[PDB]
Amino acid sequence: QCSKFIVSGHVQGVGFRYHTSHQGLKLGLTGYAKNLNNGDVEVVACGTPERLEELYLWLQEGPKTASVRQVRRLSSELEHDYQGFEIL
Amino acid sequence: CSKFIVSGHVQGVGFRYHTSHQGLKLGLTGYAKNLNNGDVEVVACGTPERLEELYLWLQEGPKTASVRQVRRLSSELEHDYQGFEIL
Amino acid sequence: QCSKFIVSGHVQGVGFRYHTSHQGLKLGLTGYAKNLNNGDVEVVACGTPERLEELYLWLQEGPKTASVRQVRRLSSDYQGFEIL
Ligand code: MOO
Ligand code: MOO
Ligand code: MOO
């Protein structure tokens, strides 16, 4: 039920983890946005494939402060349990 | 305070959070609650004009949920809440 | 940098601190939106000069419930963007 995404660009320190968690919550998703050591943001989100598809669209095109260069889709077959959408 | 019963595809789709967010942005207090039948019950406290704005939002604001119908229940409840709860 | 904005108008009890803090967090800012005894709201924000200009733009013209009359630019690590 979870898909992981790797987001690159000017994406740290620009409200991206916060806004991502907000959008995820508005979509009824659970999961996290995490700063990675290399400057990217890792997003894991859990729910329906359609919801995850909208989230992936938003990550690419949604109004946001960050400047997204690439949104890479990793596994879509992750089996995780999250209570909310945490910033990590 | 007013009470609204929202029916449709409204659970598991971020409706209570999005509602709480719209309420807080309007300075309203109250709650969005999942009902066992699949409805969501919304109580909001504020000026009549702000509660109408929440009503417009419930009906037509861009959201994930598919709202079938927004039922206007009582509008003269006298409650006190601190924030806007997701219940 | 940090900046302080004294916002006046119908700005209390109208979701102004919540929305302002939401807007700051979406911008990557830290600081607070504080109700003042006199009815003003005092917004302090810390981040890049560019991101602070974006907050100011929002305070003055951003869609919101509050009816802002004036936004005072004044001089000024916070964790998050606190309501009060
Ligand atoms: O600058 Mo953030 O990505 O909400 O911690
Ligand atoms: O998918 Mo929700 O935002 O607790 O109703
Ligand atoms: O309704 Mo407000 O966002 O506590 O200043």
Side-chain angles (χ1 to χ4, degrees), chain A, chain B, chain C residues 2-84:
Chain A
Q1 290 316 106
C2 311
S3 297
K4 166 172 291 171
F5 314 88
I6 306 299
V7 184
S8 55
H10 186 6
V11 288
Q12 292 184 5
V14 284
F16 189 60
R17 294 179 299 180
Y18 172 80
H19 202 167
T20 292
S21 80
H22 179 64
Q23 182 68 29
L25 293 169
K26 301 196 306 174
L27 291 168
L29 294 172
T30 55
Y32 69 82
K34 170 181 191 164
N35 278 352
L36 296 181
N37 198 64
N38 79 328
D40 301 342
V41 179
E42 185 175 89
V43 177
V44 164
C46 305
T48 70
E50 182 189 2
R51 283 323 158 268
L52 298 170
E53 196 59 22
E54 304 187 69
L55 172 68
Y56 170 71
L57 184 55
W58 175 90
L59 293 175
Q60 304 168 266
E61 74 167 26
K64 63 176 63 57
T65 305
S67 291
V68 176
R69 164 186 81 81
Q70 209 177 95
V71 186
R72 198 166 86 241
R73 286 184 283 192
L74 274 46
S75 181
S76 64
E77 295 183 340
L78 293 191
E79 176 180 330
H80 299 188
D81 175 35
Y82 296 99
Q83 191 188 316
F85 216 111
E86 272 315 296
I87 306 171
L88 299 176
Chain B
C1 313
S2 298
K3 170 179 288 184
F4 303 94
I5 307 292
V6 183
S7 66
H9 176 11
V10 295
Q11 295 185 0
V13 284
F15 184 70
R16 299 174 300 179
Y17 171 83
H18 201 169
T19 297
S20 71
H21 182 67
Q22 272 281 331
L24 291 165
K25 263 160 49 184
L26 284 156
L28 306 177
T29 50
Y31 66 83
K33 184 156 75 93
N34 273 351
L35 301 182
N36 181 78
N37 77 342
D39 285 347
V40 170
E41 155 175 309
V42 180
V43 167
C45 302
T47 57
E49 297 81 16
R50 305 276 173 266
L51 304 166
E52 286 302 307
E53 300 197 54
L54 181 68
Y55 174 84
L56 274 56
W57 189 85
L58 300 164
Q59 288 281 23
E60 310 294 330
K63 66 183 69 81
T64 298
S66 300
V67 165
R68 201 199 308 282
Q69 172 177 126
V70 182
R71 216 166 92 202
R72 289 182 193 262
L73 263 65
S74 170
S75 54
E76 32 191 7
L77 311 178
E78 296 182 292
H79 301 200
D80 284 293
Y81 300 92
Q82 270 286 167
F84 208 113
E85 285 315 313
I86 299 154
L87 299 170
Chain C
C2 293
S3 300
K4 177 191 303 169
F5 309 84
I6 302 305
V7 177
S8 58
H10 184 22
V11 297
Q12 302 196 347
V14 285
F16 182 72
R17 290 168 308 168
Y18 175 84
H19 200 165
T20 296
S21 72
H22 174 75
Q23 185 66 38
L25 289 172
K26 280 192 312 184
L27 289 162
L29 299 168
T30 50
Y32 63 77
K34 183 158 60 176
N35 271 347
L36 294 182
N37 289 332
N38 82 327
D40 294 346
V41 170
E42 168 181 288
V43 181
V44 156
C46 300
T48 64
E50 293 78 14
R51 222 59 76 193
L52 304 163
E53 281 311 302
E54 296 200 49
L55 187 54
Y56 174 96
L57 303 204
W58 180 87
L59 289 170
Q60 194 80 250
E61 285 315 310
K64 61 171 88 52
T65 300
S67 301
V68 180
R69 298 250 294 169
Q70 189 164 210
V71 178
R72 217 55 102 159
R73 304 172 169 264
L74 294 187
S75 325
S76 176
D77 334 274
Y78 294 104
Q79 307 285 114
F81 211 103
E82 299 303 328
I83 292 165
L84 244 60

